[PDB]
Amino acid sequence: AKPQPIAAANWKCNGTTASIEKLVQVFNEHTISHDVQCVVAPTFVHIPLVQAKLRNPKYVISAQNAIAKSGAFTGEVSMPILKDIGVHWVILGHSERRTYYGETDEIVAQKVSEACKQGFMVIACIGETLQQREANQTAKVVLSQTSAIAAKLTKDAWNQVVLAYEPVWAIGTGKVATPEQAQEVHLLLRKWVSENIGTDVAAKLRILYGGSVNAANAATLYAKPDINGFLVGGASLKPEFRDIIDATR
Numbered sequence: 001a002k003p004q005p006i007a008a009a010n011w012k013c014n015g016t017t018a019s020i021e022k023l024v025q026v027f028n029e030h031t032i033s034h035d036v037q038c039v040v041a042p043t044f045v046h047i048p049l050v051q052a053k054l055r056n057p058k059y060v061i062s063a064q065n066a067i068a069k070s071g072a073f074t075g076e077v078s079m080p081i082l083k084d085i086g087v088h089w090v091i092l093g094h095s096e097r098r099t100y101y102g103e104t105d106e107i108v109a110q111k112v113s114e115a116c117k118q119g120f121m122v123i124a125c126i127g128e129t130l131q132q133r134e135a136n137q138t139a140k141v142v143l144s145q146t147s148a149i150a151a152k153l154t155k156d157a158w159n160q161v162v163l164a165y166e167p168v169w170a171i172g173t174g175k176v177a178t179p180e181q182a183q184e185v186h187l188l189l190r191k192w193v194s195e196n197i198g199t200d201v202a203a204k205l206r207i208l209y210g211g212s213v214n215a216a217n218a219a220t221l222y223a224k225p226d227i228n229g230f231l232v233g234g235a236s237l238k239p240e241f242r243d244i245i246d247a248t249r
Contacts, residue, residue, distance in 0.1 A: 003204050005222070005229040005248035006162060008039035008123060009236030010064065010091060010210075015046055023237065024053045030242045032058045034249045036229070039123070040236075041091055044077050051086065062089035062123070065097060068114035079118045090115055091231075093125045093145075095168050105148035113152035116160045123162045123208070123231065124149055130169040139188055146189060150197065158197060162206045163189060164231040170211025172233060179224050182209045186226035215240040218247035 020042065032038070041062040042050045050061055063082050070078040082090065092115065093108035103111075108124070115122045126145040128138045142165065153161070165185050170177050186207045194202035209221055210231030221227050229248050235241060 002225070003206055003228060004035055004037060006037045006039060006123075006206055006208055007229050007241075007245045007248055008041065008062070008091075008164075008208065008231045009241055010041050010094070010231055010233050011043065011046075011237060012064070012096075012233055013043060014237060015043060017046075017049060019237075020046055020049060021053060023239075024050060026239050026242070027059065028054065028056050030056070030245070032056070032245060036245060036248050038245060039089055041089075047085065047087060060089055060121075061087055062091055062121075063087055064091050064094070066090050066092075066111070066115070068111060068118075079115055079120065083118060083120075088119060089121045089123070091123045091125065091164075093149075095125060095127060095166060095171055098125075099168075105145055108145075109148045109152045112149050112161070113157070116153060116157040119160075121160050121162065123164050125164045125166055125210075125231070127166040127168050127171075127211070133167065133169065138185065142185060142189060143192055146192065147196070155198060155201065158193075158201045158205065162208060164208040164210050165189065166210040166231060168211075172212070174212050176212035176214075176217050176221075177209065179221050179227075182221060183224035183226055186224070190226050213244060215243035215247070218244045222247050 038059040039062050041064045066079045067076045092111045097103040112124050126142050128141040132141050190202050206228040208229045208231050209227050213230045213232045214235045
């Protein structure tokens with residue numbers, strides 16, 4: 001059978017106090033009856049508000065990024081600071097950070113390793129660009145990104161890792177991957193983990209899909225055997241996130 005699914009909301013750089021209060025109320029009033037881990041990732045400045053208002057017991061709060069250590073890093077937020085305020089999930093290596101903010105495979109792998117050492121659950125993002133897909137490099141790219149992370153982890157650390165496969169061409173564009181496209185990559189990843197890390201790790205690993213997931217396409221993605229849930233951007237700012245959660249039944 002499949003491991004426990006995850007439905008994760010990446011709000012990105014969005015929100016006002018009023019809109020967040022309304023959306024959290026919607027999430028609180030949605031009764032979830034199956035075993036799923038829901039995750040909401042607000043901007044840093046909204047974490048305290050969401051902590052105060054979110055009561056649905058299926059949810060945890062995640063940060064959208066972090067650095068490993070406190071110190072002289074003006075503008076950044078560290079993992080120890082997040083832990084002290086009660087946040088123990090983080091998204092690392094999102095495409096937007098790899099693209100705009102210079103996060104290379106080695107930077108991502110270092111961050112993931114440090115988060116695991118500090119007791120975080122980590123959603124680590126990987127995925128290929130349109131050019132790489134059309135060059136038939138998808139497998140090489142996603143396995144390179146994954147092996148860079150794996151090189152800095154011990155086997156036990158994998159209990160804290162969730163992989164999110166987000167093809168860059170699907171992020172925010174409306175052009176979701178087909179279920180067959182996503183399943184092909186998820187199966188390739190799970191096999192790599194099984195051979196290189198362990199079959200026990202691979203059977204428990206959650207591999208999420210993201211990139212233009214909405215409430216109408218989520219259930220047909222989740223039907224595939226190696227898809228364990230979703231990392232959702234635009235649709236997670238809307239009430240229809242409730243139906244994305246319920247598509248993981």
